Design a protein around this nucleic acid. Structure first.
Ligand SMILES: [Mg+2]
Ligand SMILES: [Mg+2]
Ligand SMILES: [Mg+2]
Ligand SMILES: [Mg+2]
Ligand SMILES: [Mg+2]
Ligand SMILES: [Mg+2]
Ligand SMILES: [Mg+2]
Ligand SMILES: [Mg+2]
Ligand SMILES: [Mg+2]
Ligand SMILES: [Mg+2]
Ligand SMILES: [Mg+2]
Ligand SMILES: [Mg+2]
Ligand SMILES: [Mg+2]
Ligand SMILES: [Mg+2]
Ligand SMILES: [Mg+2]
Ligand SMILES: [Mg+2]
Ligand SMILES: [Mg+2]
Ligand SMILES: [Mg+2]
Ligand SMILES: [Mg+2]
Ligand SMILES: [Mg+2]
Ligand SMILES: [Mg+2]
Ligand SMILES: [Mg+2]
Ligand SMILES: [Mg+2]
Ligand SMILES: [Mg+2]
Ligand SMILES: [Mg+2]
Ligand SMILES: [Mg+2]
Ligand SMILES: [Mg+2]
Ligand SMILES: [Mg+2]
Ligand SMILES: [Mg+2]
Ligand SMILES: [Mg+2]
Ligand SMILES: [Mg+2]
Ligand SMILES: [Mg+2]
Ligand SMILES: [Mg+2]
Ligand SMILES: [Mg+2]
Ligand SMILES: [Mg+2]
Ligand SMILES: [Mg+2]
Ligand SMILES: [Mg+2]
Ligand SMILES: [Mg+2]
Ligand SMILES: [Mg+2]
Ligand SMILES: [Mg+2]
Ligand SMILES: [Mg+2]
Ligand SMILES: [Mg+2]
Ligand SMILES: [Mg+2]
Ligand SMILES: [Mg+2]
Ligand SMILES: [Mg+2]
Ligand SMILES: [Mg+2]
Ligand SMILES: [Mg+2]
Ligand SMILES: [Mg+2]
Ligand SMILES: [Mg+2]
Ligand SMILES: [Mg+2]
Ligand SMILES: [Mg+2]
Lengths: 58, 50, 51, 159, 148, 223, 185
RNA sequence: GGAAUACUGCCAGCUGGGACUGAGGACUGCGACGUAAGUCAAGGAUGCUGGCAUAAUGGUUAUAUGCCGCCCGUCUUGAAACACGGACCAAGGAGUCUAACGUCUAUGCGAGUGUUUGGGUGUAAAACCCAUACGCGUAAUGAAAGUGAACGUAGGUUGGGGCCUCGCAAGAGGUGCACAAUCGACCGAUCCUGAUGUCUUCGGAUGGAUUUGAGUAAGAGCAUAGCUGUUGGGACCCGAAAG
RNA sequence: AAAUAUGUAAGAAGUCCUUGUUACUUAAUUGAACGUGGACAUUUGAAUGAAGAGCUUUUAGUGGGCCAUUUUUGGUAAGC
RNA sequence: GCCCUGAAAAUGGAUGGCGCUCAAGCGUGUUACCUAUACUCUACCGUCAGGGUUGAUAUGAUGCCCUGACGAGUAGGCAGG
């Protein structure tokens, strides 16, 4: 027999019991999908800028 | 049926397994037999060593 | 243990706020206003009683 | 059957502005985008490439990446009961610097300036925005302004 | 023990724990792994990717422990030498009265290079070592003796 | 020990003596502050009239809100605003500082509340009879001045009339003063609501919405 | 009624004693709650709590984990607290001196420590020497090193681990585990 | 022109009648009035008088009186239903045991762990003792041949409880295990690079890459037990038409 | 071309000055990213609230719905 | 505006009933009064939270003590008995 097809009734009630939150947040965020050459060079600008600091401790 | 995040088990019990269950209730009393018959072997083997 | 309400029972009324003693003493829960003869300008009454 | 193609229901969303069809002006191509820039997404349907899906029409987000012809933008999007992180590859033609952030930066520059000219006087600042307050007392005068007094109007058909 | 069991708590509530609408019927959805490729597919992908289909080469009459080659890292190595005897060899540090460790006798079958050992010579007898394991031994004044 | 006692004690017996002199001094000061201010706006009105003008008064900075609708069948938006002003139970009421940012709140919520411009009288009696403070959650009744000073002293305010003043005048730490104040639990109006149905607007025949300086007669009967 | 904004009668989701029943532990608690209460000293409040932990949240602290935390600047002479049980690690050689307060020590672990002229106190001993927990270095173990937690998150592209009862090719290494067999993960 | 009054609001102005309550049980608090000694309505009731003995009173019960109350169980959006089961009562009557497991918890030992196939021994199916192995764990990765975990205080950055120093504090610096985020290094797979060599076709050093692994990066595991949950089993109990 | 709804922002993960790293990029020590060092804490950048925030694991039931105001489709209509 | 006509269905009946005509009807206004498991104050039970406390000192330390808030419930979860 035929039955109800669709509804969003009650769905925001359900979503808002323990939900929405926000999105989680971080300094130094994921580098997913950033320009590979730049990453490659960033890699090197970091090793260097590291190095140079340990040289400043002797 | 299949559900939840569990490992896939492979328990072969689709075959009248209960007709063939060997429960070692005699583990105890058989130790006594295995002794008592080692003892009485050691006898008639004179002074020989089992 | 028991809430007492200063709006009755003078004791807790005086526990909080001592100034009540004097407040009462000087009345000033009344206290006459001053006095001024400042009358209202003509246009004020013209408009008031206007149609 | 129902039809839920990629650009469905977008007949008026991706139309151009009345008497603003044709070449997209050069300004658009001269604005420069760094990471951490807050961009407004608004598709241009003449530039078919690098198009934002219709969801993101009207949505603001932050650049996470910069490329030859497009920025990558991070959008937070609610699905179900939670925001998910969304990475968009949009050509610059569909993107705009968000003025509201420029109000902010300009205000931050203001608030460092105000703060200086106070320590240079050792006086107090009062830097937070206050919201629109009540109103203080006034004395309006009747000089040249004797209140015209009005009354309600009769009914009258004009047809 | 049954005394602590939930079904004791349930006595007197209809329908056990199992509900009124949805019953506790006799295998909805099928027995065991039924409909893996069908109605039980969302669970089978995620939670068990890879489950379906073949992969790789077959091997008839394979005999485990034809491949018996248990591993040992330098990371330990000195465990193979008896505790009390160890201190002695640790300080003696000599290339001339270097200790011998028969790893195959210990039950191992390949030395691997994880970790560091101290500069003390060791004669290590084994079958198979990692290119790096023997590099560290050799650099601590020891050598590797291949056996069988 | 037998002597170190009547040191700290008569220290504080007479240290109390002072804290009380200061209250005594402020409380009087506040009277003046009030008596004058209210006289001012009177004569201000009579002058303006005398000079053919009209002293139009300062817009109220303070309103008291009582919630009069219960807790069922409330729309999500006003329901939220209802809670953010701590009106979460029928006939409970709090003070609200009026700015545009709070005014638009009142608006949103207007069918469920009944509010207006309180008076020193109504506030005095509301804080005295129904004043409870917030200390580590706990709703603690203000029966001794020490409690306020132990909690609100940092912002001045070491008495109950220090609490009152900071409200009626709004002023600097109103926020923290008012928040300290647990929502007032009023009764139902002894005397009645003065109207057949309450869930129309005051302008339409009763309750709900801004009834302005009528809120006092209302509160006082719920107090 | 009340338009509750908060779930009524909720319990602080926090252990409050050990679930354990070792009378000696309950005694150790009875000690450190006294300390925790009658002092300031953050240390005791922290140890108190950490006695409540379940065996999973008390992963073992290793003897190499101790030694390495002792190469910290200005720490060589502190006394390392390990509200848990310290184990032995054949992998460090030169091992320093120091006194270590733990709950339990494995056999080899009180060896190693002692042999190096070091000490093995108990927390109620530690209590006496350091009422306010002075000169102490608290060390916890690696929780996430557990094998259970390997399978937490198991989903497509989460890159976690299957719960499989036995591994090899022929065990969930095909469809869904590679591009050539449908799709990958 | 000078008043009154209404209406409205204020008083820490003064008072009469009626109702319900009296929690607490030494003292500690904040006050009040007193010139004082002291007194008090100030962190919860005392005082005075009287009534009751085969009784005053209270509990149960029956009945009457006022108001109110459809039959439970069940499936259902909806049952008191003109939906079903149930005339009545007693006894019986339905989530179990098992093999293999997931999470969590207790306990033992811990880089190991599991005495019980078996042997020893016994106050004899118990308890006490043990040699070799074996299982799981301590190495991963490839279909495989195979190869196999430190550039570095076992790395850098950011939070980080605790502890250390300065301080009377407020604070400031130092170190920062667990845990989280992030950049890097190591191991195997893949694709490049292809030195020193050799028997010319073997050999694969070195350095790499938006690829990749259920890995490394000072181990956590093994075992006994319990609740809950999973799969095979008669599988909570009763039930086909059939074969 | 509304109303109602709807995105984002309102700071220590900030602002400023100095000058470090790199194989990216620039005609270019030019930029770009990431840093060292220095300075700036009363309101440190609107309101109101906060009954604490954050986080993990695991499992039950459920997976026939229906009603009212308002918006609204089919139908003459319907307790459709 | 109110009232009248337009206005026909099957057991005998329904402004809830009686009955009501300057209403006990219709429109409007003013006060007073009645009454929910709701609101205000207090006792008691429980649940949850915060705090004090075996310092040498008889009988529960999973205890004693002080304080605040809260309490609907099928299917279902856990807990104490
Ligand atoms: Mg159907
Ligand atoms: Mg239907
Ligand atoms: Mg459906
Ligand atoms: Mg359909
Ligand atoms: Mg038999
Ligand atoms: Mg269509
Ligand atoms: Mg449209
Ligand atoms: Mg044109
Ligand atoms: Mg194309
Ligand atoms: Mg139950
Ligand atoms: Mg139930
Ligand atoms: Mg049933
Ligand atoms: Mg599925
Ligand atoms: Mg190892
Ligand atoms: Mg009242
Ligand atoms: Mg009256
Ligand atoms: Mg009355
Ligand atoms: Mg009226
Ligand atoms: Mg460090
Ligand atoms: Mg870990
Ligand atoms: Mg591991
Ligand atoms: Mg009493
Ligand atoms: Mg009697
Ligand atoms: Mg009866
Ligand atoms: Mg009836
Ligand atoms: Mg009847
Ligand atoms: Mg039906
Ligand atoms: Mg029924
Ligand atoms: Mg019927
Ligand atoms: Mg039926
Ligand atoms: Mg009968
Ligand atoms: Mg019957
Ligand atoms: Mg029977
Ligand atoms: Mg029976
Ligand atoms: Mg292999
Ligand atoms: Mg049958
Ligand atoms: Mg048959
Ligand atoms: Mg057949
Ligand atoms: Mg919004
Ligand atoms: Mg706030
Ligand atoms: Mg669930
Ligand atoms: Mg579910
Ligand atoms: Mg389901
Ligand atoms: Mg169903
Ligand atoms: Mg008819
Ligand atoms: Mg009839
Ligand atoms: Mg009508
Ligand atoms: Mg009438
Ligand atoms: Mg009327
Ligand atoms: Mg009641
Ligand atoms: Mg309940």
């Amino acid at each position: 027999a035929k039955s109800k097809n669709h509804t969003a009734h009650n769905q925001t009630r359900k979503a808002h019991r323990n939900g929405i939150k926000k999105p989680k947040t971080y300094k130094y965020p994921s580098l997913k999908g950033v320009d590979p050459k730049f990453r490659r060079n960033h890699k090197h600008a970091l090793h260097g800028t590291a190095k140079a600091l340990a040289a400043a401790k002797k | 049926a299949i559900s939840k995040n569990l490992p896939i088990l492979k328990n072969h019990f689709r075959k009248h397994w209960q007709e063939r269950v060997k429960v070692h209730f005699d583990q105890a009393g058989k130790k006594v037999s295995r002794r008592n018959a080692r003892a009485t072997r050691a006898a008639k083997i004179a002074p020989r060593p089992l | 243990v028991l809430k007492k309400n200063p709006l009755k029972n003078k004791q807790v009324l005086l526990r909080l706020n001592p100034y009540a003693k004097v407040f009462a003493a000087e009345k000033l829960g009344s206290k006459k206003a001053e006095k001024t003869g400042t009358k209202p300008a003509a246009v004020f009454t013209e408009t008031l009683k206007h149609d | 059957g129902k039809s839920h193609g990629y650009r469905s229901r977008t007949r008026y969303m991706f139309q151009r502005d009345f008497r603003k069809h044709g070449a997209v002006h050069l300004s658009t191509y001269l604005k420069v985008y760094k990471v951490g820039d807050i961009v407004d997404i608004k598709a241009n349907g003449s530039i078919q490439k690098g198009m934002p899906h219709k969801f993101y029409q009207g949505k603001t987000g932050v650049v996470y990446n910069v490329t030859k012809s497009s920025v990558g933008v991070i959008i937070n999007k609610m699905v179900g009961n939670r925001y998910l992180e969304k990475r968009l590859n949009l050509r610059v033609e569909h993107i705009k610097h968000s003025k509201c952030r420029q109000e902010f930066l300009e205000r931050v520059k203001a608030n460092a300036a105000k703060r200086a000219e106070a320590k240079a006087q050792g006086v107090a600042v009062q830097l937070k925005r206050q919201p629109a307050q009540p109103r203080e007392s006034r004395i309006v005068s009747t000089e040249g302004n004797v209140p015209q007094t009005l009354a309600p109007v009769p009914y009258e058909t004009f047809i | 023990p049954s005394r602590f069991t939930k079904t004791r708590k349930h006595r007197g509530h209809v329908s056990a724990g199992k509900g009124r609408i949805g019953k506790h019927r006799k295998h909805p959805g099928g027995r065991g792994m039924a409909g893996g490729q069908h109605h039980h597919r969302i669970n089978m992908d995620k939670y068990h990717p890879g489950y379906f289909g073949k992969v790789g080469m077959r091997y008839f009459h394979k005999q485990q422990a034809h491949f018996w080659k248990p591993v040992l890292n330098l990371d330990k190595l000195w465990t193979l030498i008896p505790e009390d005897k160890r201190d002695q060899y640790l300080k003696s540090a000599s290339k001339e009265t270097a200790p011998v460790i028969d790893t195959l006798a210990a039950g191992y079958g390949k030395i691997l290079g994880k970790g560091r050992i101290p500069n003390v010579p060791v004669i290590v007898k084994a079958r198979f070592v990692s290119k790096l394991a023997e590099e560290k031994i050799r650099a601590a004044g020891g050598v590797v003796e291949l056996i069988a | 020990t037998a002597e170190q006692v009547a040191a700290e004690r008569a220290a504080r017996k007479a240290a109390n003596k002072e804290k009380r002199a200061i209250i005594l001094e402020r409380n009087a000061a506040y009277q003046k502050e009030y008596e004058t201010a209210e006289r001012n706006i009177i004569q201000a009105k009579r002058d303006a009239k005398a000079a053919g003008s009209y002293y139009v008064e300062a817009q109220h900075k303070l309103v008291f809100v009582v919630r009069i609708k219960g807790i069922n069948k409330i729309p999500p938006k006003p329901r939220k605003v209802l809670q953010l002003l701590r009106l979460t139970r029928i006939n409970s009421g709090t003070f609200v500082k009026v700015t545009k940012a709070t005014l638009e709140l009142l608006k949103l919520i207007e069918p469920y509340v009944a509010y207006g411009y309180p008076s020193y009288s109504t506030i005095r009696q509301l804080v005295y009879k129904r004043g409870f403070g917030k200390i580590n959650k706990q709703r603690v009744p203000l029966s001794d001045n020490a409690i306020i000073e132990a909690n609100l002293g940092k912002y001045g305010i070491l008495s109950i009339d220090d609490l009152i003043h900071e409200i009626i005048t709004v002023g600097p730490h109103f926020k923290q003063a008012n928040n300290f104040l647990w929502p007032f639990k009023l009764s139902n109006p002894s005397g009645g609501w003065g109207v057949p149905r309450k869930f129309k607007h005051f302008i339409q025949g009763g309750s709900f919405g801004n009834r302005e300086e009528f809120i006092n007669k209302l509160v006082k009967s719920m107090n | 009624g009340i338009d509750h904004t908060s779930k009524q009668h909720k319990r602080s989701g926090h252990r409050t004693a050990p679930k354990s029943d070792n009378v000696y532990l309950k005694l150790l608690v009875k000690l450190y709650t006294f300390l925790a209460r009658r002092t300031d000293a953050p240390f005791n409040k922290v140890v108190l709590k950490a006695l409540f932990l379940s065996k999973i949240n008390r992963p073992p602290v290793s003897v190499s984990r101790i030694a390495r935390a002792l190469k910290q600047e200005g720490a060589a002479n502190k006394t390392v607290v390990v509200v848990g049980t310290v184990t032995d690690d054949a992998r460090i050689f030169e091992f320093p001196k120091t006194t270590v307060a733990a709950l339990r020590f494995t056999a080899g672990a009180r060896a190693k420590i002692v042999k190096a002229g070091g000490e093995c106190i108990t927390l109620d001993q530690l209590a006496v020497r350091a009422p306010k927990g002075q000169n102490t270095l608290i060390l916890r173990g690696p929780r996430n090193s557990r094998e259970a937690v390997r399978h937490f998150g198991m989903g497509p592209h989460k890159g976690k681990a299957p719960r499989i009862l036995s591994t090899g090719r022929k065990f969930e290494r095909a469809r869904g585990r590679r591009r050539s067999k449908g799709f990958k993960v």
